[PDB]
């Protein structure tokens, strides 16, 4: 079968940071080969299962989250790491049992004239719980003098655009992050290598 990873790797579209797709794969053999051999991977960090032994473990469910984030802040996608991403829009469980892959992709997202297409969550009322989607548009409400659905001194739109340019630098420039999560359940295991 050899279920492809290109559906989540080489797809031209990417939910910015919060509409991140949650694609589950089943009844296949990943083979985890191209994931390790490729030398273009900026970051390849795994927790728990060692990188070499992935093919030897037969799980039952595998999730492949995908998105893009500021290049400098890629480190924030890790267990037990707080900041302005994990704390507001996409948090990972402390006892995580998966891998995270980060690519440097400038030629594909940083347009010469500038790109403002990709959105970014900044403001929220309460902290975020692990593995939850927070697609939202309601205007931020500071509290006292809560205004209404309008922009004012205390009231702000809880979204922003990265504003990518070709020559921002190593940081502040597109990165492409894919998080592979493995889960084992009482149901029979199906996903593993040769």
């Amino acid at each position, epitope marked *: 079968n050899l279920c492809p990873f290109g559906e989540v790797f080489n797809a031209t579209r990417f939910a910015s940071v919060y509409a991140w797709n949650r694609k589950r794969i089943s009844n296949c053999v990943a083979d985890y080969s191209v994931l390790y051999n490729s030398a273009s991977f900026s970051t390849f960090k795994c927790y728990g299962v060692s990188p070499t032994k992935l093919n030897d473990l037969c799980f039952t469910n595998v999730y492949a989250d995908s998105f893009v984030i500021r290049g400098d802040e890629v480190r924030q996608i890790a267990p037990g790491q*707080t*900041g302005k991403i994990a704390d507001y829009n996409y948090k990972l469980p402390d006892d995580f049992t998966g891998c995270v892959i980060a690519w440097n992709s400038n030629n594909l997202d940083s347009k010469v004239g*500038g790109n*403002y297409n990709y959105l970014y969550r900044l403001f929220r009322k309460s902290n975020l719980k692990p593995f939850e989607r927070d697609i939202s548009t309601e205007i931020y409400q500071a509290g006292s003098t809560p205004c209404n659905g309008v922009e004012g001194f205390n009231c702000y739109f809880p979204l922003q655009s990265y*504003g*990518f340019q070709p020559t921002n630098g*190593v940081g*502040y420039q597109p990165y492409r992050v894919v998080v592979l999560s493995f889960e084992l359940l009482h149901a029979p295991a199906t996903v593993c290598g040769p």
Partner: antibody
Framework: EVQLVESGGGVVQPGTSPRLSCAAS????????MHWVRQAPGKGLEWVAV????????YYVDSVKGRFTISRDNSKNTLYLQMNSLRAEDTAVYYC??????????????????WGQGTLVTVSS | DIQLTQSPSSLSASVGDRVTITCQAS??????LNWYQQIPGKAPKLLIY???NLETGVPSRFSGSGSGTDFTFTISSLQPEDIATYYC?????????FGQGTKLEIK
């Protein structure tokens, strides 16, 4: 090849509104607002005011709210600040610094990366 | 309403000594803070943005860390050049107060 030039200060009498103007050397100026900070003569520095992405938001210091008017001429790629009124505490040096995170549509540069030069605005009669 | 407070407010370390200055902020500030290099009558420029990374151009000796409500800024081997004042500022909440200031001296 980035730098910023300020001017429009000096001996200023009370009740006047001199034009404190600063301009940029070269970049996508229209896509990056800025801020103005004030350096007390020997104490420290707090602020002056803010200018947003498309001249939309105009925030000021609470202590001096409603007095200063800060505007931007995008065509000239310059920023102007006027002085509606003065007290004895406005004897500082004004710096104007660019932005690029949590200040403008599009995060490009780290907050307060360059600054540049200064203008002395001591007020007396 | 944000209030900043730098504990030391004055240092005098040896040329080859490691100086670990600190910055404390009220409420929560998350991961938005910067440190500055105020030489008398000069632009403060920048060393560390987000309190976790050094801007491209500053010497690699300096470093920073911290989160939540507390941050630390470490200088490894300060040369006689590094005798400027240092300020810590947050930029998260619309009122972005500016740190008090810490005069650096030589023993």
């Amino acid at each position: 090849e980035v730098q910023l030039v300020e001017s429009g200060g000096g001996v200023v009498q009370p009740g006047t509104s001199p034009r404190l103007s600063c301009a940029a050397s070269g970049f996508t100026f229209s896509n990056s607002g800025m801020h103005w900070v004030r350096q007390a003569p020997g104490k420290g520095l707090e602020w002056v005011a803010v200018i947003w992405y498309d001249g939309s938001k105009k925030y000021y210091v609470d202590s001096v709210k409603g007095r200063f008017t800060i505007s931007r001429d995008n065509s000239k790629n310059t920023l102007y600040l006027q002085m509606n009124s003065l007290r004895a505490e406005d004897t500082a040096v004004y710096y104007c610094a660019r932005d690029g995170t949590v200040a403008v549509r599009g995060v490009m540069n780290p907050f307060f990366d360059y600054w540049g030069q200064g203008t002395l605005v001591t007020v007396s009669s | 309403d944000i209030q900043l407070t730098q504990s030391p407010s004055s240092l005098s370390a040896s040329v080859g000594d490691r100086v670990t200055i600190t910055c404390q902020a009220s409420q929560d500030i998350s991961n938005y803070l910067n440190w500055y290099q105020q030489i008398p009558g000069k632009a403060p420029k920048l060393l560390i943005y987000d309190a976790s990374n050094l801007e491209t151009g500053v010497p690699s000796r300096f470093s920073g860390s911290g989160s939540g409500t507390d941050f630390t800024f470490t200088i490894s081997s300060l040369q006689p050049e590094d005798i400027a004042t240092y300020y810590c500022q947050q930029y998260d909440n619309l009122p972005y107060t500016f740190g008090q200031g810490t005069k650096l001296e030589i023993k």
